Design a protein around this ligand. Structure first.
Ligand SMILES: [Cl-]
Ligand SMILES: [Cl-]
Ligand SMILES: [Cl-]
Ligand SMILES: [Cl-]
Ligand SMILES: [Cl-]
Ligand SMILES: [Cl-]
Ligand SMILES: [Cl-]
Ligand SMILES: [Cl-]
Ligand SMILES: [Cl-]
Ligand SMILES: [Cl-]
Ligand SMILES: [Cl-]
Ligand SMILES: [Cl-]
Ligand SMILES: [Cl-]
Ligand SMILES: [Cl-]
Ligand SMILES: [Cl-]
Ligand SMILES: [Cl-]
Ligand SMILES: [Cl-]
Ligand SMILES: [Cl-]
Ligand SMILES: [Cl-]
Ligand SMILES: [Cl-]
Ligand SMILES: [Cl-]
Ligand SMILES: [Cl-]
Ligand SMILES: [Cl-]
Ligand SMILES: [Cl-]
Ligand SMILES: [Cl-]
Ligand SMILES: [Cl-]
Ligand SMILES: [Cl-]
Ligand SMILES: [Cl-]
Ligand SMILES: [Cl-]
Ligand SMILES: [Cl-]
Ligand SMILES: [Cl-]
Ligand SMILES: [Cl-]
Ligand SMILES: [Cl-]
Ligand SMILES: [Cl-]
Ligand SMILES: [Cl-]
Ligand SMILES: [Cl-]
Ligand SMILES: [Cl-]
Ligand SMILES: [Cl-]
Ligand SMILES: [Cl-]
Ligand SMILES: [Cl-]
Ligand SMILES: [Cl-]
Ligand SMILES: [Cl-]
Ligand SMILES: [Cl-]
Ligand SMILES: [Cl-]
Ligand SMILES: [Cl-]
Ligand SMILES: [Cl-]
Ligand SMILES: [Cl-]
Ligand SMILES: [Cl-]
Ligand SMILES: [Cl-]
Ligand SMILES: [Cl-]
Ligand SMILES: [Cl-]
Ligand SMILES: [Cl-]
Ligand SMILES: [Mg+2]
Ligand SMILES: [Mg+2]
Ligand SMILES: [Mg+2]
Ligand SMILES: [Mg+2]
Ligand SMILES: [Mg+2]
Ligand SMILES: [Mg+2]
Ligand SMILES: [Mg+2]
Ligand SMILES: [Mg+2]
Ligand SMILES: [Mg+2]
Ligand SMILES: [Mg+2]
Ligand SMILES: [Mg+2]
Ligand SMILES: [Mg+2]
Ligand SMILES: [Mg+2]
Ligand SMILES: [Mg+2]
Ligand SMILES: [Mg+2]
Ligand SMILES: [Mg+2]
Ligand SMILES: [Mg+2]
Ligand SMILES: [Mg+2]
Ligand SMILES: [Mg+2]
Ligand SMILES: [Mg+2]
Ligand SMILES: [Mg+2]
Ligand SMILES: [Mg+2]
Ligand SMILES: [Mg+2]
Ligand SMILES: [Mg+2]
Ligand SMILES: [Mg+2]
Ligand SMILES: [Mg+2]
Ligand SMILES: [Mg+2]
Lengths: 174, 174, 174, 174
């Protein structure tokens, strides 16, 4: 038993490791999207940079779980990071739709972890999720939903001018 | 009788209270428009912020009437603030058309109050309306009319790209 | 269904709209108190400004619920804002007593919303209430209770000198 | 006829001279109040300074009418400045009551001048009164009414402590 461990259930420790893997999986998916939009035959560089930044944020989410695990006296256990579901991402609308789904998947995993933490009467873990993760997910989901509404307004996937304008005006200039 | 009261007709006092209610009504309508454009399935954030700012301006107009009433020795009497006419606002063109109508309605109420103040030989109230309200209405009506002309130019309501571009270029970036 | 919506119960969405109305109701009550203390036959201007600021804070609380509703994919539904319970507020002690009651009423509505959010297993909504609303209410209730104790110490309602001194020393100079 | 004169009725010219005299009369009354509160057996120095400043403001109002008269091509005609109605002013409450009456008397003279200017179709004179005089009177009347309400609250005329506190807290420290 770790000398620091107190009120930390084995099931929560394991669930934190699984969540860490999912954060790294999400980071790798966003890295793939970055590389796709950087292709010479895609060439939407502000969209590419949006996904690059999302990839870095997910890696930070992962690292925060590693630090959490050690703070509670659990032990980090790593597994393979599975490659993303696609090798190419179609266009800005398809990528944003995949990102929305991924953010929802990550959100559901965090909500399920909160359920477990609640069941095991772990208020520290509940607070950590509420203060560091759940609102970040709500914000990200809203941002991507707003993007999808604008992409549809701009006539994606058919309207190339619309896609060009989204890259210039809706995502940060890089 | 209030110790400060001089040359202030009961009819003007009552009309000032009614005008105060109308300013608060207009504020609430613009607040509704703000919330509509902030919806994830609408997502025109500069348009949303334009209406949020209009809502705050109307609240300031209301407060200025409250202060006026007390300065003249009248008594503020409040009534329910009726909810706006619509729960959803269609699109930027429909909202701007409703805003134009509302600004005209507010303008007519101010002009009618000026008529009453004139009839009751109240030059202080005439001056207050001319100096604090009437030109603000003319300016706002012109601004919204100019917007409507541009929205029609941009192909609203059908042209989604046009609507996107209006949000980026015609209203202040927020 | 909104594309952003996840783990957000219809009952919570409706309760958020009701809470929004109550915040706007509280804002309007404090606006009425402001106008009362600004009367030439009342003339307690620091008390008036205290209530004006409280009115603006409640409007901010309302706007925060509007933004929350949209972030979760719920839909803002507005109702009439009922006029305050009184047209005149007696004196500083009666107004502070009404403010204490109102802050308790708002607090109970927030606590009831937390109960509902708990029942529907919505940790994001729980966190939002805990982090943005519940402590603000506890602070406000304590501040007003402290004021009431001082008003009674100063001999309200009979002691006019006491009431004058409260305005000069207990509320911020405006 | 003055080479500059245009649309300026003889009756308005005469009424401007009478108004000038009334402004100087009001200045002299406030000067008397200043000297009274500066007496060693009165000794309310912030009250004294309030009246001194009011006296200087009235002299400025007079000078503005002199300049106006010449701008329109009328001719300044001066009359004796009558001494104030009282040689001693009782206390802060009696003086403020006399000041309220005097400000109302000045206001009525300005309103009567506006009536005359209206009758003679002189929009320049109407504007001058509205922009330079009428709101100043409304503000001053409200300020003095608020003072009287506070003086009564503080137990004037009997409550000497109340009178002392008014001088310390309600008027500007000099
Ligand atoms: Cl352990
Ligand atoms: Cl343990
Ligand atoms: Cl425990
Ligand atoms: Cl365990
Ligand atoms: Cl594990
Ligand atoms: Cl942390
Ligand atoms: Cl596998
Ligand atoms: Cl996919
Ligand atoms: Cl693929
Ligand atoms: Cl997914
Ligand atoms: Cl968070
Ligand atoms: Cl452009
Ligand atoms: Cl541009
Ligand atoms: Cl956008
Ligand atoms: Cl009255
Ligand atoms: Cl009157
Ligand atoms: Cl009159
Ligand atoms: Cl009347
Ligand atoms: Cl009324
Ligand atoms: Cl004003
Ligand atoms: Cl009705
Ligand atoms: Cl409408
Ligand atoms: Cl509707
Ligand atoms: Cl309308
Ligand atoms: Cl104006
Ligand atoms: Cl434009
Ligand atoms: Cl929904
Ligand atoms: Cl849901
Ligand atoms: Cl869930
Ligand atoms: Cl539901
Ligand atoms: Cl509802
Ligand atoms: Cl927030
Ligand atoms: Cl009802
Ligand atoms: Cl009440
Ligand atoms: Cl009442
Ligand atoms: Cl209540
Ligand atoms: Cl809080
Ligand atoms: Cl002090
Ligand atoms: Cl205190
Ligand atoms: Cl001449
Ligand atoms: Cl002439
Ligand atoms: Cl003419
Ligand atoms: Cl003539
Ligand atoms: Cl003359
Ligand atoms: Cl001038
Ligand atoms: Cl004589
Ligand atoms: Cl007198
Ligand atoms: Cl005398
Ligand atoms: Cl007089
Ligand atoms: Cl003025
Ligand atoms: Cl003191
Ligand atoms: Cl005072
Ligand atoms: Mg050990
Ligand atoms: Mg274990
Ligand atoms: Mg993450
Ligand atoms: Mg594989
Ligand atoms: Mg937080
Ligand atoms: Mg946004
Ligand atoms: Mg009275
Ligand atoms: Mg009346
Ligand atoms: Mg207005
Ligand atoms: Mg109705
Ligand atoms: Mg004017
Ligand atoms: Mg102007
Ligand atoms: Mg313009
Ligand atoms: Mg949809
Ligand atoms: Mg529902
Ligand atoms: Mg509140
Ligand atoms: Mg009712
Ligand atoms: Mg909790
Ligand atoms: Mg807190
Ligand atoms: Mg305190
Ligand atoms: Mg000549
Ligand atoms: Mg003549
Ligand atoms: Mg004067
Ligand atoms: Mg004489
Ligand atoms: Mg006029
Ligand atoms: Mg003015
Ligand atoms: Mg004041």
């Amino acid at each position: 038993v770790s000398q620091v461990r107190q009120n930390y259930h084995s099931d929560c420790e394991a669930a934190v490791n699984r969540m860490l893997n999912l954060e790294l999986y999400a980071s790798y998916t966003y890295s793939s999207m970055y590389a796709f939009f950087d292709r010479d035959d895609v060439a939407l560089h502000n969209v590419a940079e949006f996904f690059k930044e999302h990839s870095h944020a997910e890696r930070e989410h992962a690292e925060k779980f590693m630090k959490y695990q050690n703070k509670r006296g659990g032990r980090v256990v790593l597994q393979d990071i599975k490659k993303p579901e696609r090798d190419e991402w179609g266009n800005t609308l398809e990528a944003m739709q995949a990102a929305l789904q991924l953010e929802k998947t990550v959100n559901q995993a965090l909500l399920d972890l909160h359920k477990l933490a609640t069941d095991k009467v772990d208020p520290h873990l509940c607070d950590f999720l509420e203060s560091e993760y759940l609102e970040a997910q709500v914000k990200a989901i809203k941002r991507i939903g707003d993007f999808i509404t604008n992409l549809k307004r701009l006539g994606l996937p058919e309207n190339g001018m619309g896609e060009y304008l989204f890259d210039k005006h809706s995502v940060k200039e890089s």
